[PDB]
Amino acid sequence: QAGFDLLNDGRPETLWLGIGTLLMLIGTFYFIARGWGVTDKEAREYYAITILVPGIASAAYLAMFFGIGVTEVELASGTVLDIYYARYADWLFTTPLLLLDLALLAKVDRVTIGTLIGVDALMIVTGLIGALSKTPLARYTWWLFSTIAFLFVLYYLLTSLRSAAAKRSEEVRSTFNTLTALVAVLWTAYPILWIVGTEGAGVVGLGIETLAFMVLDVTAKVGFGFVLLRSRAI
Amino acid sequence: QAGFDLLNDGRPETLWLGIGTLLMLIGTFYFIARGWGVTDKEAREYYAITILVPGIASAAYLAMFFGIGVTEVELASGTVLDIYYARYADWLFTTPLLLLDLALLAKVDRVTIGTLIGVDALMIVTGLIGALSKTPLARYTWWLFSTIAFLFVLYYLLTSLRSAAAKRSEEVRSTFNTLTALVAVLWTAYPILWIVGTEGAGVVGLGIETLAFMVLDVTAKVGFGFVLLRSRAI
Amino acid sequence: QAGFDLLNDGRPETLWLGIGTLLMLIGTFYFIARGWGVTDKEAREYYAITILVPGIASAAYLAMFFGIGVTEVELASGTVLDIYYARYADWLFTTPLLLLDLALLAKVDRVTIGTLIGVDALMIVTGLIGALSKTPLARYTWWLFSTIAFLFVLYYLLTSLRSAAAKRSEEVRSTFNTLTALVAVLWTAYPILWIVGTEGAGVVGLGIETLAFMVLDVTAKVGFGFVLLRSRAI
Ligand SMILES: CC(C)CCC[C@@H](C)CCC[C@@H](C)CCC[C@@H](C)CCOC[C@@H](CO)OCC[C@H](C)CCC[C@H](C)CCC[C@H](C)CCCC(C)C
Ligand SMILES: CC(C)CCC[C@@H](C)CCC[C@@H](C)CCC[C@@H](C)CCOC[C@@H](CO)OCC[C@H](C)CCC[C@H](C)CCC[C@H](C)CCCC(C)C
Ligand SMILES: CC(C)CCC[C@@H](C)CCC[C@@H](C)CCC[C@@H](C)CCOC[C@@H](CO)OCC[C@H](C)CCC[C@H](C)CCC[C@H](C)CCCC(C)C
Ligand SMILES: CC(C)=CCC/C(C)=C/CC/C(C)=C/CC/C=C(\C)CC/C=C(\C)CCC=C(C)C
Ligand SMILES: *C/C=C(C)/C=C/C=C(C)/C=C/C1=C(C)CCCC1(C)C
Ligand SMILES: *C/C=C(C)/C=C/C=C(C)/C=C/C1=C(C)CCCC1(C)C
Ligand SMILES: *C/C=C(C)/C=C/C=C(C)/C=C/C1=C(C)CCCC1(C)C
């Protein structure tokens, strides 16, 4: 595929995974550096949550790079897919943390937060099961199950969180609205890329798909974190 | 075994797993529908916890149905068991949530809740290790270890929780007592079914065992949830 | 290696793993017995956290003993390592609980606790990835990644926690300082033993390495717990 086989193991996508690891590590250390002498109780909570997002993603990217984070799945057809399963390990912790950032900005109640986290975790685990599934009936049923969970996530974000956020100051509202729009646009790309990529129809090859996830991830983690942590809205 | 090989993959138990998935999904969506316009802070907490119970079980059942949620374990004897390991993934999240429902009804302290959840999770993980174990000495030692944890769970329920629940109103007490009795009776069946079924002595075949877990699960999740969520006791 | 092949499966290290299991179980039950009639809210929290530490370790040790908790990893060189991966499952829950004990003694803020737990969990997961990795470049990169996380853990302990602990009474301070010194000394041994043992350079054989982890674990769990739970500092 598109890329460069950095480790001489026949995976040109490692170019994008190695770039991804580097960008996540630089983002992590930049947020740590920025957060270093912050005293405000509220601000340090946003820094703690947000540093761990690209920090966790750094490890997932590095595992994918080295190769332990990819597995072969032999489909009913006999097609062998290379499934980067470490992505789901990453998202299972980072997607709840990103939602937690939004929930803290909105100052929503604890039940809403628990609801969001639970439904989002369900989305990720069912997405992982789908990626590992051997039959096309099972793979697409899971994508559908996970996609429904995603829709509940978007729903609570654009109703419950947004209405809580409405009660805050204009500066908090501005930051919340920008980050919620970034989430609604960027996160929607994931189930689309999955279904057109190697996981699904195979119209996008692994190399391009890996580059595309790397861009979405870095924007969703380091971009989102930069916009959040630079904000007066803390 | 007893059932009907829905997917033509040689597993007659998929009849009961497919029925299980459907019943969990209907229960999930019925609780979501019932909870939709609920405003009371306390009530919505019970709805959030309880919807996720059959929701998580829906996914475990569907994984078992399709087949990814079963694995072959080759015993020291040479007997190959078909172990539905996805059950333990389900119970690890749903059993703590069901206990959390009871702890909220009783209004027990946070230390008691943490204790319950930790011991219950230990029960489930050691049950999973036992199900996957190759030697009869190991399988029965784990069943014993997990059974001891279960006894601590029952113990805290029937002492700490029940004494906290005694302080609430008759209507709260009535609901707590009914659900605690349902837990003490239904949950006790699980280690029994395990030890007489394919996991253990093999006196009950997989088909009947799968139907029996499906009945216990639906009653323990959708039954328990219906009794809880219909209650004034919120 | 050094030891005695208790289960006749060619693993002399099971002598130390069986001793480890017994010592963890006795520690668990001694803390349960000691904690049985304790009413003080604060004290029971320390008992709940601390009993679960050797309780969880009991299960990991027993899994290692029986053999399910060891796996073969075939390195790029062709060397087959026997990796006791169940240790990482243990540490992922027990290391956060031990830190939680220290954080409660110091009465540090909730952000600090979340930070500690997250970084410590990252340390353990990256240590597990390293232990399972096939190439020497990957194994040592992970040891380095995990070691950096460990350094953040030590850092927050010896700055944030210690400065919070300074505000408490002499008796609380004395207990906190003793346990923090035990953590700084004992936990530092783990990455050292890993890099000189089978996981790393192979200068220490598996038998001696298993005995060495058993001593460190029992001291770090039952020793630490005995010093904590005997203390007026609750
Ligand atoms: C590891 C856990 C303790 C953490 C929880 C992860 C969980 C949320 C995700 C489930 C993992 C699941 C997808 C694995 C299933 C893959 C399966 C098909 C088998 C392939 O595995 C092959 C073997 C080596 O030959 O590796 C076996 C590999 C191991 C199963 C684990 C390696 C997984 C990733 C490489 C980890 C990268 C993610 C981050 C490091 C997460 C750490 C964050 C921390 C703060 C919790
Ligand atoms: C998946 C995790 C991130 C979630 C935590 C699960 C954890 C509590 C339970 C441990 C799982 C463990 C029993 C797996 C061990 C099985 C092992 C013998 C190997 C067999 O696995 C084979 C490969 C495919 O060839 O699948 C490999 C399959 C994968 C290991 C995972 C699939 C597990 C189940 C099919 C998942 C169904 C349960 C629900 C979807 C849980 C989601 C709830 C959510 C809110 C967390
Ligand atoms: C089990 C989970 C629900 C709990 C979370 C554990 C998690 C934090 C750690 C990740 C586990 C990961 C290291 C496993 C990767 C090993 C992999 C290379 C494959 C080898 O596995 C082989 C199969 C059997 O043939 O066993 C497959 C074995 C299974 C994957 C699981 C067995 C793991 C250990 C033997 C468990 C011992 C630890 C304690 C029992 C933990 C319980 C504490 C509780 C309160 C949560
Ligand atoms: C390859 C092999 C066959 C499979 C690997 C096994 C994997 C799947 C095991 C991973 C299991 C892991 C995901 C367990 C989940 C753990 C998640 C948590 C412990 C989060 C819970 C944290 C709560 C306890 C915090 C509560 C917060 C309070 C303060 C309100
Ligand atoms: C840092 C990573 C982020 C923000 C990842 C977001 C990922 C998702 C929203 C994944 C969604 C998926 C579905 C809706 C269906 C199945 C495929 C999944 C996991 C990709
Ligand atoms: C929805 C599922 C429920 C309520 C499941 C409950 C399961 C248990 C109480 C399992 C108990 C077990 C033991 C006590 C010993 C080993 C076998 C286990 C897991 C089945
Ligand atoms: C009860 C167990 C305890 C207190 C275990 C502590 C383990 C560690 C501090 C492990 C540290 C490691 C590194 C710093 C690098 C990689 C090897 C690890 C896991 C051993």
Residue numbers in the entry:
A (entry chain A), B (entry chain A), C (entry chain A): 1 to 234
What's in the article?
Aus-2, functions as a light-driven proton pump. Since the light-driven proton pump bacteriorhodopsin was discovered in the cell membrane of Halobacterium salinarum, a large number of proton-pumping rhodopsins have been found in diverse species, including archaea, eubacteria, fungi and algae. Although the structure of the proton-release pathway is highly conserved among proton-pumping archaeal rhodopsins, aR2 possesses the following peculiar structural features: (i) the motional freedom of the tryptophan residue that makes contact with the C13 methyl group of retinal is restricted, affecting the formation/decay kinetics of the L state, and (ii) the N-terminal polypeptide folds into an Ω-loop, which may play a role in organizing the higher-order structure.
In this study, we have applied the membrane-fusion method to prepare a novel three-dimensional crystal of aR2. Compared with the previously reported crystal forms of aR2, the new crystal has several advantages: (i) it diffracts X-rays to a higher resolution, (ii) the problem of crystal twinning is avoided and (iii) the hexagonal array as seen in the native claret membrane is reconstituted in the crystal. In space group H32, one subunit of aR2 is contained in the asymmetric unit; i.e. the aR2 trimer is supposed to have perfect threefold symmetry. Specifically, a hydrocarbon chain (possibly squalene) is positioned at the centre of the trimer, breaking the threefold symmetry. Owing to these properties, the new crystal provided accurate structural information about functionally important residues. The retinal chromophore bound to the ∊-amino group of Lys220aR2 in helix G adopts the all-trans configuration. Although most residues in the retinal-binding pocket are highly conserved in proton-pumping archaeal rhodopsins, Met145 in bR is replaced by phenylalanine (Phe150) in aR2.
